[model samples]
Target: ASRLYTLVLVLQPQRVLLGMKKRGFGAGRWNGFGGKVQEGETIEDGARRELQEESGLTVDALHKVGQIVFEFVGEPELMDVHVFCTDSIQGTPVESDEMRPCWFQLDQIPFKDMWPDDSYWFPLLLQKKKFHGYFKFQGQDTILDYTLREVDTV
Candidate 1:
């Protein structure tokens, strides 16, 4: 069964918004725009809602980049992640209840605070190049034990 779901927003360098999540939430150490899908809601609807909830920006064009499922040993549930990209959007971003929003440069991303695996394929996505990767992590440390690839347009 699927346990958790997420929509990863791939915004441009200047469009990227950074947020400081209040402590206590898992994966709150770094900054990104996303949230879990609510029950009875479509993935796309959840993605759009999350985007608006996390960052006050409304995007009309959210392209589905890919989907990934994470399975852990002995765990009965799978964590499904829905990846998305949007080069064009409207409105300025603002801090919301879930996060503190701010912009960052493409080359000046704060990798130090993000998930250890983000730095791996994020760059490719930022460039509008399509790619898929599977990451294994023992807690927060990436094991890089397995992976797969695909063109973005696939």
Candidate 2:
């Protein structure tokens, strides 16, 4: 079975919000704020909750921008990540145990320090294009193969 997850990008005029994972999973890497969806909450609600929990900022509306599936060679389940984008938010972002929030200029995104697959789909996100992607990984760092395409809607 595929597990559901969320990844949010806080978009602004010329910058984006990213968090440095403090521990677990993608620790030491810079990425978005989100996690697995809890039982009972709507998927969008889960994303919003995760943002607040990890970054201390609350957002009401999130644009469903993309969906990416990840497969690890030795893992049995796939990660179905729902990607979202938000331009409006309340409260200044504060760091938490899970993440240290920071803003990066649009032209300065640190792709080399992020998940390998991000280099493929992140450009689509920046273009505000709805997309779908899949990546087969040999481990955490090497992508064995992948596919990506723009869609009318995610």
**Structural similarity to truth (TM-score) of each candidate:** 0.82, 0.98
lDDT of 2 by residue, 24-135 (tens): 9999999998999999997899899999999999987899999999999989999999999999989999999999999999999999999989899998889889999999
Error (Å) of candidate 1 at residue 88 is: 2.4
Clashes of each: 1, 0
Query: Candidate 2 lDDT (Cα, whole model)?
Result: 0.94
Q: Which segments of candidate 2 are over 4 A away from where they belong?
A: none
Residue 17 local lDDT, model 2: 95
TM-score between candidate 2 and the true structure: 0.98
Residue 99 miss distance in model 1 (angstroms)? 0.8
Model 1 TM-score (2 dp): 0.82
| Top of the candidates by lDDT | 2
RMSD of each: 2.4, 0.7
CA displacement after TM-score superposition, residue 131 of candidate 2 (Å): 0.4
lDDT of 1 by residue, 1-154 (tens): 8755665564774766567775545446555667688899988788888778877777878887766566555567767777787877678777777777667777778887886666776776676766666666565555546565667463
